[PDB]
Design an enzyme around this catalytic site. Structure first.
Site, PDB file in Angstrom:
ATOM      1  N   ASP A   1      31.781  43.296  29.885  1.00 38.58           N
ATOM      2  CA  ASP A   1      32.607  43.232  31.040  1.00 38.58           C
ATOM      3  C   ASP A   1      31.876  44.138  32.250  1.00 38.58           C
ATOM      4  O   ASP A   1      32.610  45.226  32.489  1.00 38.58           O
ATOM      5  CB  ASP A   1      33.865  43.531  30.597  1.00 38.58           C
ATOM      6  CG  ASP A   1      34.745  42.447  30.207  1.00 38.58           C
ATOM      7  OD1 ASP A   1      35.811  42.756  29.416  1.00 38.58           O
ATOM      8  OD2 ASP A   1      34.320  41.245  30.360  1.00 38.58           O
TER       9      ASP A   1
ATOM     10  N   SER B   1      39.833  31.071  31.537  1.00 38.80           N
ATOM     11  CA  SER B   1      40.373  30.933  30.291  1.00 38.80           C
ATOM     12  C   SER B   1      39.336  31.058  29.303  1.00 38.80           C
ATOM     13  O   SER B   1      38.023  30.757  29.548  1.00 38.80           O
ATOM     14  CB  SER B   1      41.097  29.446  30.040  1.00 38.80           C
ATOM     15  OG  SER B   1      41.726  29.002  31.312  1.00 38.80           O
TER      16      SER B   1
ATOM     17  N   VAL C   1      41.852  31.589  22.942  1.00 40.00           N
ATOM     18  CA  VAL C   1      42.053  33.171  22.693  1.00 40.00           C
ATOM     19  C   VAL C   1      42.347  34.008  23.887  1.00 40.00           C
ATOM     20  O   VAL C   1      43.034  35.023  23.799  1.00 40.00           O
ATOM     21  CB  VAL C   1      40.738  33.612  22.071  1.00 40.00           C
ATOM     22  CG1 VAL C   1      40.235  32.823  20.673  1.00 40.00           C
ATOM     23  CG2 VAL C   1      39.365  33.470  22.952  1.00 40.00           C
TER      24      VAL C   1
HETATM   25  C1  SQY Z   1      37.093  41.243  26.610  1.00 45.08           C
HETATM   26  O1  SQY Z   1      35.873  40.323  26.498  1.00 45.08           O
HETATM   27  C2  SQY Z   1      36.175  39.009  26.445  1.00 45.08           C
HETATM   28  O2  SQY Z   1      37.147  38.616  26.562  1.00 45.08           O
HETATM   29  C3  SQY Z   1      34.799  38.265  26.603  1.00 45.08           C
HETATM   30  C4  SQY Z   1      35.072  37.145  27.347  1.00 45.08           C
HETATM   31  C5  SQY Z   1      33.932  36.282  27.825  1.00 45.08           C
HETATM   32  C6  SQY Z   1      33.219  35.173  27.141  1.00 45.08           C
HETATM   33  C7  SQY Z   1      32.227  34.681  27.244  1.00 45.08           C
HETATM   34  C8  SQY Z   1      31.248  35.307  28.218  1.00 45.08           C
HETATM   35 BR1  SQY Z   1      29.495  34.837  28.247  1.00 45.08          BR
HETATM   36  C9  SQY Z   1      31.615  36.275  28.737  1.00 45.08           C
HETATM   37  C10 SQY Z   1      32.546  37.046  28.620  1.00 45.08           C
HETATM   38  C11 SQY Z   1      34.588  38.178  25.234  1.00 45.08           C
HETATM   39  C12 SQY Z   1      33.125  38.124  24.793  1.00 45.08           C
HETATM   40  C13 SQY Z   1      32.918  37.944  23.274  1.00 45.08           C
HETATM   41  N1  SQY Z   1      34.034  37.740  22.421  1.00 45.08           N
HETATM   42  C14 SQY Z   1      35.270  37.855  22.941  1.00 45.08           C
HETATM   43  C15 SQY Z   1      35.448  37.674  24.198  1.00 45.08           C
END
Ligand code: SQY
Ligand code: CL
Ligand code: CL
Ligand code: CL
Ligand code: CL
Ligand code: CL
Ligand code: CL
Length: 337
Positions: free
Chosen positions: A155, A27, A26
């Site tokens: 983030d 690394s 969807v």
């Molecule tokens: C834009 O945000 C992201 O791309 C995060 C990636 C992300 C994954 C796990 C952790 Br623990 C921290 C970060 C995301 C979080 C939740 N659902 C999709 C993606």
């Protein structure tokens, strides 16, 4: 120790516990967690210990994610490594709930929608700020939203000069004192960002879409007025002080004539967030008590955080010392109920 299995997904090797199934890039990958029943997002860190700066950044991110336990903030469901010893430790994987969309993807918003979305951002911020954490990068792409209008902050700011140059959303939500390095900043920079997000939900338009740093500053000063002597004294750069003093003075505008037709209580709150002098901005705890949120505010359900020790930020360590601290935090993780 769980049983791990391996698979190559789009030229990426993933070695994960059996509990995680149906991985899809969807690394970052989406997956189904058979222990909790949640759809999850799994992030595999790239080269986490390649330099002192990168090893410390990896430790910082894991410490922050392990601390956050709040309905409106990203939290950690799991963290793991396939390594069986510190000597072979090299990869870190992080797991959280899968979120389907961000605030952009959602944004016809009514005033009731704006009330509920901004209330949730402020509730999460009261929690974050109570631990003396500053997000620093609040913007619509860093806010996850679902079908029921429920929201989470993600983030955190753990950005380069080229990233903030020109006509870019990476800069449009930044407080002026941090955009131009006027002074040591604090948690009030996040309230400026909330004001910019709220204005955009109300109007459908970016509030300060500057074509560069200077054009953006001119847009900001036209709305909120040029600085007075009180704030000028607080700008530590003599250089920036001289530049500000070269601009013709401007009064603060009437926000009821800028945000035409908006709820007067929303106009009042925006005036209290978008204050040039950061010492005088409303705090998150104060804003939750504002009359705009009367339909949602509950002082018995707006929790604060446990204290957060950031003394490591001033510590000088070697790569393998940062790596050993990270390994300790991985193996000590205890999952939520
Ligand atoms: C834009 O945000 C992201 O791309 C995060 C990636 C992300 C994954 C796990 C952790 Br623990 C921290 C970060 C995301 C979080 C939740 N659902 C999709 C993606
Ligand atoms: Cl398992
Ligand atoms: Cl490993
Ligand atoms: Cl954005
Ligand atoms: Cl006006
Ligand atoms: Cl603290
Ligand atoms: Cl701590």
């Amino acid at each position: 120790r769980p049983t791990f299995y391996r698979q190559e997904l789009n030229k990426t090797i993933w070695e994960v516990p059996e509990r995680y199934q149906n991985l899809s890039p969807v690394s970052v990958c989406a997956a189904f967690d058979t222990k909790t029943g949640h759809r999850v997002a799994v992030k595999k860190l790239s080269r986490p210990f390649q330099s002192i700066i990168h090893a410390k950044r990896t430790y910082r991110e894991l410490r922050l994610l392990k601390h956050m336990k709040h309905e409106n903030v990203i939290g950690l469901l799991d963290v793991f490594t396939p390594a069986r010893s510190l000597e072979e430790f090299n990869d870190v994987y992080l797991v959280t709930h899968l979120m389907g969309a961000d605030l952009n993807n959602i944004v016809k918003l009514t005033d009731d929608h704006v009330q509920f979305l901004i209330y949730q951002i402020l509730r999460g911020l009261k929690y974050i700020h109570s631990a003396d954490i500053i997000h620093r990068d609040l913007k619509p792409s860093n806010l996850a939203v679902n079908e029921d209008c429920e929201l989470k902050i993600l983030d955190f700011g753990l950005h380069t000069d080229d990233e903030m140059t020109g006509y870019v959303a990476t800069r449009w939500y930044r407080a002026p004192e941090i955009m131009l390095n006027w002074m040591h900043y604090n948690q009030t920079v996040d309230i400026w960002s909330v004001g910019c997000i709220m204005a955009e939900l109300l109007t459908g338009r970016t509030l300060f879409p500057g074509t560069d740093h200077i054009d953006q500053l001119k847009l900001i000063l036209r709305l909120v007025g040029t600085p007075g002597a009180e704030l000028l004294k607080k700008i530590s750069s003599e250089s920036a002080r001289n530049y500000i003093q070269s601009l013709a003075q401007m009064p603060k505008m009437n926000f009821a004539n800028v945000f035409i037709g908006a709820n007067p209580l929303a106009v009042d709150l925006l005036e209290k967030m978008l204050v040039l002098d950061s010492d005088k901005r409303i705090t998150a705890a104060q804003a939750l008590a504002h009359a705009y949120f009367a339909q949602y505010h509950d002082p018995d359900d707006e929790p604060v955080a446990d204290p957060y020790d950031q003394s490591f930020e001033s510590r000088d360590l070697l790569i393998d010392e940062w790596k050993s601290l990270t390994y300790d935090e991985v193996i000590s993780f205890v999952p939520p109920p």
